[PDB]
Design a protein around this ligand. Structure first.
Ligand SMILES: *[C@@H]1O[C@H](CO)[C@@H](O)[C@H](O)[C@H]1NC(C)=O
Ligand SMILES: *[C@@H]1O[C@H](CO)[C@@H](O)[C@H](O)[C@H]1NC(C)=O
Ligand SMILES: *[C@@H]1O[C@H](CO)[C@@H](O)[C@H](O)[C@H]1NC(C)=O
Lengths: 450, 450, 450
């Protein structure tokens, strides 16, 4: 009733079921501002111990401003091809290159720290001001020093200026090594207290807000931070947040391992494996498939993915899990005579493909080995199991507890004849190999009757 | 006259033209030094609030010096195989393991911060001294504390010593997690003010200097920082800068998408796609091709790549863009019966390969959908277009404005017979498939005349 | 007698021998604790320059504690599939979700900073307390401020509190961007002085301790740091250390390059290359093979790898280096008609595959070019050589000095007939291609006798 899993002996593949979706659908674009107090090198050289320390701590304020301005060639019109997810925010970086749009933003920021601004393109973008140093320099630092005859207040304005400017240092220190775009969204670019404020104000239901509130760090993983322009005493940069629109549909992850024969001599055995491994979720009737599991993040029962790196597949694709020889969907597989033992760790278990003189075993935490694996594709539920060894490689099984079901079946590699079996197929399918069988056997059928 | 692009309907491929090259040709090697004032634990235990704070801030000065010395096994003679770009700087890390060469460098640094040094190998390497603490400890910190009866000046020498030593902390904090080699060149290893000083002094023309001056962050992306030795009160480490020698030649990026038929039943259709996708540039007559676009960085009109991860190709390779059936160059393609819809975002447009009941569309910012795609390979210019949907996947098109040209043609997948079409070819070519056609048809031609 | 290498002309492959193993065998799990002094917002608003600075420096102490608590969904039961190396530490993160186990740990930490704790699962895990702020706030910060009528001592308790809390900031600043698991083990999570203390106390021989002591940074590369729970004024997180069990066996790295013919017209030549390239080491009789060299780290004579990303292979696999046509082990190769020039840098040399009008050369540091390469697969020892050019690509050879041996032989690509040669084989073998030859020639043998 929580997290289940079923292993198919016929196909040497396992499916872990019970997960819930949270797919990235849109890009919540937003801009954060930093007020500035641009002053030139009018320094009064009263070389005192309380004056030079502010000279050092403000020269870093100078290196961390002109540096952001040189990063202007990213990205007005570059990034050809991939990485097209930031193009929803690059549309905002291009708006900030327009006169009057910069000024129209500084308006509603000097009175409430946050407000929605109407632009030239008109996109309803929110605005923030996370650090204000124009109001800390032109009111606290400039008047006591510029016209009051070079009067430094004390030493607590040197430590506080260090901590009020430390946030700006570690941002230019981060943007310069990232060509203007950072990911994940580091706490320097947005602390935890500020992010939870922006999520409550997104054009989304109260449901998705609770999700991104208790799962903060996952929102960071799939968020960006682009650098636009620096002009008119304002630092302008855009941060993209994921808009989860496909939520609460079921998900399941497919696990596959090679399935070979053990009734031949050395390399005279034949193998096959199901290709399309990874995460599958329901996305309005059709099935969204995520090949590289590197784009999906798992958090307890939740699965967060980006639909950009996904193949869209029809609902009739679940048939490969049971009846792989169905006429509606043609299931993809690969074939080879390469006979190598291997193991695959799943959600609540492990698949073992043992072939040859390989020492394949599953061991227990306390009493050592508990099951020696014979040759062939086998599976074991993690109940009481902790480690699995295959030759000189040892794996640990995730001790997430769940109900694992074994589905016995005739391994479909036996339904094939080794003579007319394809030597190697990269990404073939059931129909493509039965056609290649009907092709190689087409010569033997119509030539030996002489 | 600025940035153009042309789509070939015959080949289901698009070429974006108008870019300008900037290829990494050489490795400007350089060494940066740090003077040290090695003092032993002769601490006067006058446990005062202004004494223990310097004890803490100098114990970090101790952890961040002995730590760099343990990182000596990288890289005197390791790194077998790949990563051979640092071998121009490792040649300098091996020179610093020689007596007398270390001393000969400390000479011209205590009087001008920078000078060229003749070595034992003799490579004209430049030298820098970005942070001097031997002159800040043995002159400011040591005399007031060691022999003046444990006399701490004040508290401004605790904050300034914090900021004068903070740079050393975040370097050993970075080298220890990077095994002695960091990339990109972080501002900790070299700030913006110091890098722009070294570029003006490189054995290059005034042209490449302006390039690396307005495109600083890109130079960082393709730069390294190796750790050599720590001895004789000196921290020694080498930083490699890219020497761009192939500059201002034209470049173009190739985009490809599957091209299939829609005149058969389910999987009875045939597909083909052009393999060699990516960046191409002119490099002295021949064409330098960059397969993994991850090694190329785009900055407006400029394209920066590393010629180490490039295939060198003859000039007669541009023929695949137009006349793919040319006798001079044999164009590479792959074939498959896999019929999956997909989209490819280009520079100023998007290619759509729509097959089956897939919902393929291009949508507008304001008025929603503007063109439904039929089955087959199609292209759309980004003029007024903003998004493209393929099933459950949505892409954003780069709104870089340019002149896109459509080149209509007969899709070459129709010139093939589905019976004698290769089931799957990984990286074949026109000649290799016409030979395999002339092979499969060789049996049907000389056996049915009975 | 130190580092050797031999190139096989018959196979266009080189083997670098003389390296010594250090394979990751087990996971030394350990937990580090941080005592806390949880106080609520009972701040006395005596807005003084020495009071507000501690308010700022302690509000960061608040953001860096509640932030770690939201990262609780990683990883109680997630991470489906890959990344199963932390499951030895996740077993400890699951123990910390149990009442009484948290309290039983705080015992032996308030008196000796370190002791072994018996748990509910009972795993003998060590414990540490690297930073104590419960004893710095409830004894130094709380009594002077809470009940002594809001009395701030001085300003040296603001700088020291900055440096005593700076370590906690850059950890939550690192865990939040890493979803609770960081790698490599940064010095923030464990400084050099503390790591060398834990290695001396591992259930290992005195040998492996010296290894991980002079090779510290490599131990960091293959170590993790998981985040468990935050409760009862204690920060709990687990760090995994590698247990090297397979040590001091010989290792060798295989290098391969395409081997083609130069006796045909354009693409009428045939090529083949040995597939399984990378690191091989001895692991109890059998041979542990590491395909992706990205999992192996080289440090002088030592080679550190993780046996999780390794194929286990029989001892009879060294035969492919000499007699590739042996009956005991079937050597894997790939074939293609693609005739592209390329070079491969090895340990103490370089392999060059020169084909077509490609300009292939090896150049010297002083006197330029020293050997022009003819068409075919050739090798050169690094004695006096520094660079190798292939078309527009230039490589640097590692100037590690050693004894390179040339083993001349008949290139095995000539023993094949171009008519019945496979157009392309992804990962075939000698037997699989001789069978495909015995298949294509099976028709010509039994059909032309008419
Ligand atoms: C193979 O050919 C037979 C006729 O001999 C036919 O009945 C069968 O359906 C064919 N199979 C495929 C997969 O085309
Ligand atoms: C295929 O064979 C025919 C002869 O029947 C020949 O004219 C043609 O050039 C051949 N094509 C190839 C690609 O070899
Ligand atoms: C190929 O067939 C011949 C018989 O004509 C046999 O002697 C030889 O061993 C076979 N080779 C292979 C690799 O099967």
């Amino acid at each position: 009733q929580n997290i289940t899993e079923e292993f198919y002996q016929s196909t040497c593949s396992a499916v872990s079921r019970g997960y819930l979706s949270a797919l990235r659908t849109g890009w919540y674009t937003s801009v954060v501002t930093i007020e500035l107090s641009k002053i030139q090198k009018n320094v009064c050289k009263s070389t005192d111990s309380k004056v030079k320390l502010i000279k050092q701590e403000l020269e870093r304020y100078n290196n961390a401003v002109i540096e952001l301005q040189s990063l202007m060639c990213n990205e007005p019109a570059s990034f050809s091809g991939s990485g097209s997810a930031i193009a929803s925010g690059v549309a905002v970086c291009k708006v900030l290159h327009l006169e009057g749009e910069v000024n129209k933003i500084k308006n509603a920021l000097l009175s409430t720290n946050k407000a929605v601004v109407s632009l030239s393109n008109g996109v309803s973008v929110l605005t923030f001001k996370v650090l204000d140093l124009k109001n800390y320099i032109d009111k606290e630092l400039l008047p006591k020093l510029n016209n009051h005859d070079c009067r430094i207040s004390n030493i607590e304005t040197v430590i506080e200026f260090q901590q009020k400017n430390n946030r700006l240092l570690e941002i230019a220190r981060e943007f310069s090594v990232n060509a203007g775009i950072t990911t994940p969204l580091s706490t320097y670019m947005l602390t935890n207290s500020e992010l939870l404020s922006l999520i409550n104000d997104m054009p989304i239901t109260n449901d998705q807000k609770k999700l991104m509130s208790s799962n903060v760090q996952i929102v960071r993983q799939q968020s960006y931070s682009i650098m636009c322009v620096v002009k008119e005493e304002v630092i302008a940069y855009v941060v993209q947040l994921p808009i989860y629109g496909v939520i609460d549909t079921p998900c399941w992850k497919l696990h596959t391992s090679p399935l070979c024969t053990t009734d031949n001599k050395e390399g005279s055995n034949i193998c096959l494996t199901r290709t399309d491994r990874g995460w599958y979720c329901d996305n309005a009737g059709s099935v969204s498939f995520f090949p590289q599991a590197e784009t999906c993040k798992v958090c307890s029962n939740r699965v967060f993915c980006d639909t950009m790196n996904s193949l869209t597949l029809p609902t009739d694709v679940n048939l490969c899990n049971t009846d792989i020889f169905n006429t509606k969907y043609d299931c993809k597989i690969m074939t080879s005579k390469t006979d190598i033992s291997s193991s695959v760790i799943t959600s609540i278990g492990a698949i073992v493909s043992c072939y040859g003189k390989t020492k394949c075993t599953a061991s227990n935490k306390n009493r050592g080995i508990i099951k020696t694996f014979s040759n062939g594709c086998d599976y074991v539920s993690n109940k009481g199991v902790d480690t699995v060894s295959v030759g000189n490689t040892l794996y640990y099984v995730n001790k997430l507890e769940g109900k694992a079901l074994y589905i016995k079946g005739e391994p479909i590699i036996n339904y094939y004849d080794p003579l007319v079996f394809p030597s190697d197929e990269f990404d073939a399918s059931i129909a493509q190999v039965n056609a290649k069988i009907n092709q190689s056997l087409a010569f033997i059928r119509r030539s030996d009757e002489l």
